[PDB]
Enzyme design. Structure first.
Site, PDB file in Angstrom:
ATOM      1  CE  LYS A 115      -4.648  -0.970   1.555  1.00 27.30           C
ATOM      2  NZ  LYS A 115      -5.551  -1.390   2.662  1.00 27.30           N
ATOM      3  CG  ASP A 336     -17.460  -0.357 -22.370  1.00 30.37           C
ATOM      4  OD1 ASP A 336     -17.890  -0.694 -23.492  1.00 30.37           O
ATOM      5  OD2 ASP A 336     -16.892  -1.151 -21.591  1.00 30.37           O
ATOM      6  CD  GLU A 391     -21.306   1.243 -24.059  1.00 28.33           C
ATOM      7  OE1 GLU A 391     -21.215   0.026 -23.791  1.00 28.33           O
ATOM      8  OE2 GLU A 391     -21.324   2.133 -23.183  1.00 28.33           O
TER       9      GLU A 391
END
Ligand SMILES: OC[C@H]1O[C@H](O[C@H]2[C@H](O)[C@@H](O)[C@@H](O[C@H]3[C@H](O)[C@@H](O)[C@@H](O[C@H]4[C@H](O)[C@@H](O)[C@@H](O[C@H]5[C@H](O)[C@@H](O)[C@@H](O[C@H]6[C@H](O)[C@@H](O)[C@@H](O[C@H]7[C@H](O)[C@@H](O)[C@@H](O[C@H]8[C@H](O)[C@@H](O)[C@@H](O[C@H]9[C@H](O)[C@@H](O)[C@@H](O[C@H]%10[C@H](O)[C@@H](O)[C@@H](O[C@H]%11[C@H](O)[C@@H](O)[C@@H](O[C@H]%12[C@H](O)[C@@H](O)[C@@H](O)O[C@@H]%12CO)O[C@@H]%11CO)O[C@@H]%10CO)O[C@@H]9CO)O[C@@H]8CO)O[C@@H]7CO)O[C@@H]6CO)O[C@@H]5CO)O[C@@H]4CO)O[C@@H]3CO)O[C@@H]2CO)[C@H](O)[C@@H](O)[C@@H]1O
Ligand SMILES: OC[C@H]1O[C@H](O[C@H]2[C@H](O)[C@@H](O)[C@@H](O[C@H]3[C@H](O)[C@@H](O)[C@@H](O[C@H]4[C@H](O)[C@@H](O)[C@@H](O)O[C@@H]4CO)O[C@@H]3CO)O[C@@H]2CO)[C@H](O)[C@@H](O)[C@@H]1O
EC number: 2.4.1.18
Length: 678
Positions: A115, A336, A391
């Site tokens: 992290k 998309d 799209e």
């Protein structure tokens, strides 16, 4: 000054100004990238510099965080204590650290959790998943199912090696849209290996040539269908590791199938703990992946919106594209949510009439278009045979023209208007009131200088209140009346016939490519419902009942066999890649559509009951015509009324009219393609 698109469409010169600015903004940005980064191809190699990368004797970790005042790398390798691993910030807001090998081995072990820990202006410390992490796993044991970024650098003994080349670009894309998680029959999340070994052969056997892989980019919310990405460089871990996905792509290539991936660069999940949004701590947009305020939030999707003008955002997204292409050997993508990127209003509550001022205005998002042009230029120079699909519901002109002509650079557009027309017909019109005029015009009203992919139903017609066309036709009768050992009721015969008809006409008349979503090829019943609170997280409707199509004494095999033969017909005659599209008859009273595509003559009888004996159909060359594909064939669930070896001799006319004609038998609710004998 002058763009080639102006010659394709004179109506565009009215908006020269707009395009002028746009092209300028493109050429400048590219130029900057070439001056300070060595060009787009080098710029897109950012995943070799950002994130965690092993070199000779050390490991480099880089992370862009301008808002942070202090930063360190924590993980299992230092037991989550970054005291001895503080990173250093530069003037660009980039934090970096070099960590020397420990006993000749890399400091961060493969498949270990890491992290990025940083302190923001307020003085608090927060831990986030690295933005360029390549793998991220969730622990369902803990509350939250919280994710952990995982350093993915597998050794050679478990790193997948691609063994097969990319297939050549097909003459026309026959796309099998799929979702790996719900691709199994078991009510669970399926794996990449199960999809590669069980489903890809089904796709090849049905004579598709392309797979549209959805939900690859990591998303913590399964029910988002992959549209809410959290870790843009991570292969979604619920279905396996990145090596499993590499094996999937390689197996598809071994079967001769091309693989496209869903790219979601239109927005980002709001998940702060697991996703990219966790790097928003209130900084201005010039120090953030996203815009701020209203411009940084998608009201409909409840999502964050990128600032495509930022240098690091451009590096991020272009390097993401190059990463997928190079590391996973994808053959292209479907972008998309392109409509939301094209306009500042995102088309949220706006219909596009086709008036050009709605396309080219200051509602047009120039940042996103510049990014998409850079992306298409880069992707087509890295892989000229790549297919990039957009799209977009708006029908933006020149969206699918090359960048060098003034276009956006996409190869194909999704023809998103046909499904709703079919839904309206099935829902609110009796079979004898279906308009053939409206069907033909819906299938044929498109920009013919730009390619398009037609489909009667995609994945969205299976979710959020939508049913499959097969279900819209037959409903509960599918539960009990689909056995092949008993006579089909009128409803079942009607439904099977009309499903074949809708699919075939959409393919043959709707564009330059075809798309079919996993399961709809055999009329899969019902709908798709993701696990949620409302169904106690059931997977019952989050799967594919391959049992139904595999069973010989059921009737789904008929729709599947027709789909397979239809794709094989396209493969043999190439009618999707032919500009010859003549609709030679549209009998509205008799509900008949006769058209010509490629070297094939298509006769569609949409009438509920009437048979037309000796119906005359037009044709070019005289001679001998025979059936190439007939939906009434017994193997497709018909009644076998047509007959395949019958010779349809031509007769010249005069003893939309054509030079010659021949006569056909056309039973009700049937579709027959005829070919000229050599
Ligand atoms: O060779 C030699 C051989 O041998 C052998 O074999 C053998 C053997 O042994 C023997 O045995 C024999 O066999 C045989 C037998 O015997 C006989 O029997 C037969 O069988 C067969 C048959 O016949 C056939 O048919 C087949 O079957 C099949 C089928 O096909 C399929 O389909 C399947 O089925 C299944 C399914 O799938 C499932 O699902 C199930 O179902 C179920 C369900 O689930 C439930 O639910 C129920 O249902 C019901 C209900 O409940 C009620 O309610 C109703 O409904 C209704 C309603 O009410 C109304 O209202 C309507 O609705 C509507 C509405 O209105 C609207 O709204 C819409 O909807 C919606 C929804 O709701 C929802 O979902 C939505 O969405 C959602 C979303 O997503 C979320 O997110 C949220 O938002 O929410 C939302 C909601 O709100 O969506 C939608 C919209 O979009 O709409 C709706 C609809 O439309 O209406 C309705 C109706 O539908 O009612 C119902 C029904 O009734 O219950 C059900 C049940 O029934 O289950 C099923 C089953 O059952 O599968 C099957 C089975 O498989 O097959 C069979 C077997 O095969 O025959 C045989 C023969 O052939 O013999 C043999 C020979 O030999 C050995 O074995 C072999 O191997 C060899 O080879
Ligand atoms: O100028 C020529 C340079 O071109 C390239 O530099 C890029 C950087 O690589 C990008 O990172 C970016 O720099 C941005 C930066 O992203 C942004 O955060 C901001 O920096 C903040 C900083 O985070 C903050 O801590 C503070 O102290 O300083 C800045 C105040 O906002 O703004 C930077 C400038 O845009 O863009 C530049 C190009 O514009 C190339 O990589 C270099 O080699 C080259 O010198």
């Amino acid at each position: 000054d002058h763009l080639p698109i102006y010659d394709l469409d004179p109506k565009l010169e009215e908006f020269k100004d707009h395009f002028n600015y746009r092209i300028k903004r493109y050429l400048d940005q590219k130029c900057m990238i070439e001056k300070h980064e060595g060009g787009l191809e080098e710029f897109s190699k950012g995943y070799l510099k950002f994130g965690i990368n092993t070199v000779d004797g050390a490991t480099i970790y880089r992370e862009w965080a301008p808002a942070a005042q202090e930063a360190q790398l924590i993980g299992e390798f230092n037991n989550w204590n970054g005291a001895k691993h503080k990173m250093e910030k530069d003037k660009f807001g980039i934090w970096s650290i070099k960590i020397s090998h420990v006993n000749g081995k890399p400091a961060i072990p493969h498949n270990s959790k890491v992290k990025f820990r940083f302190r923001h202006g307020g003085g608090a410390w927060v831990d986030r998943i690295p933005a360029w992490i390549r793998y991220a796993t969730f622990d369902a044991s803990k509350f939250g199912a919280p994710y952990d970024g995982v350093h993915w650098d597998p050794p050679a003994c478990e790193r997948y090696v691609f063994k097969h080349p990319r297939p050549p670009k097909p003459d026309a894309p026959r796309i099998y849209e799929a979702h790996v998680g719900m691709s199994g029959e078991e009510p669970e999340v399926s794996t990449y290996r199960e999809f590669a070994d069980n489903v890809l052969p089904r796709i090849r056997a049905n004579n598709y040539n392309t797979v549209q892989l959805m939900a690859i980019m990591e998303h913590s919310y399964y029910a988002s269908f992959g549209y809410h990405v959290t870790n843009f460089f991570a292969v979604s871990s619920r279905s396996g590791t990145p090596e499993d996905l590499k094996y999937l792509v390689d197996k598809a290539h071994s079967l001769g199938l091309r693989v496209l991936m869903d790219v979601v660069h239109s927005h980002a999940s709001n998940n702060m703990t697991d996703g990219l949004n966790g790097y928003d701590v209130g900084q201005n947009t010039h120090e953030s992946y996203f815009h701020t305020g209203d411009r940084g939030y998608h009201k409909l999707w409840d999502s964050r919106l990128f600032n495509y003008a930022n240098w690091e955002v451009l590096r991020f997204l272009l390097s993401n594209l190059r990463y997928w292409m190079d590391e996973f050997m994808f053959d292209g993508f479907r972008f998309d949510g392109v409509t939301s990127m094209l306009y500042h209003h995102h088309g949220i509550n706006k219909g596009f009439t086709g008036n050009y001022k709605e396309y080219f205005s200051l509602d047009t998002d120039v940042d996103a278009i510049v990014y998409m042009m850079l992306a298409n230029h880069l992707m087509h120079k890295l892989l000229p045979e790549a297919t990039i699909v957009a799209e977009d519901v708006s029908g933006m002109p020149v969206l699918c023209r090359p960048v060098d002509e003034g276009g956006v650079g996409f190869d194909f557009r999704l023809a998103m208007a046909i499904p709703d027309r079919w839904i309206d017909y099935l829902k609110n019109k009796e079979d004898r009131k279906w308009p053939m005029s409206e069907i033909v015009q819906t299938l044929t009203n498109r920009r013919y200088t730009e390619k398009c992919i037609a489909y009667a139903e995609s994945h969205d017609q299976s979710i959020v209140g939508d049913k499959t066309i097969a279900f819209l036709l037959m409903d509960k009768e599918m539960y009990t009346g689909m056995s092949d050992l008993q006579p089909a009721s009128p409803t079942i015969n009607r439904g099977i016939a009309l499903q074949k008809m809708i699919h075939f006409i959409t393919m043959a008349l709707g564009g330059d490519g075809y798309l079919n979503f996993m399961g709809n090829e055999f009329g899969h019943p019902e709908w798709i419902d993701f696990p949620r609170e409302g169904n106690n997280w059931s997977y019952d409707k989050c799967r594919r009942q391959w049992s139904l199509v595999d069973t010989d004494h059921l009737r789904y095999k008929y729709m599947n066999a027709f789909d397979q033969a239809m794709n094989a017909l396209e493969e043999e005659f190439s009618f999707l890649s032919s500009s010859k599209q003549i609709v030679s008859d549209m009998n509205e009273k008799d509900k008949v559509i006769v058209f010509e595509r490629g070297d094939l003559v298509f006769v569609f009888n949409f009438h509920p009951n009437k048979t037309y004996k000796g119906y005359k159909v037009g044709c070019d060359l005289p001679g001998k015509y025979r059936v190439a594909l007939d939906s009434d064939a017994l193997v497709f669930g018909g009644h076998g009324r047509v007959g395949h070896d019958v010779d349809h001799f031509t007769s010249p006319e005069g003893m939309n009219n054509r030079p010659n004609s021949f006569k056909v038998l056309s039973p009700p609710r049937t579709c027959v393609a005829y070919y000229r004998v050599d």
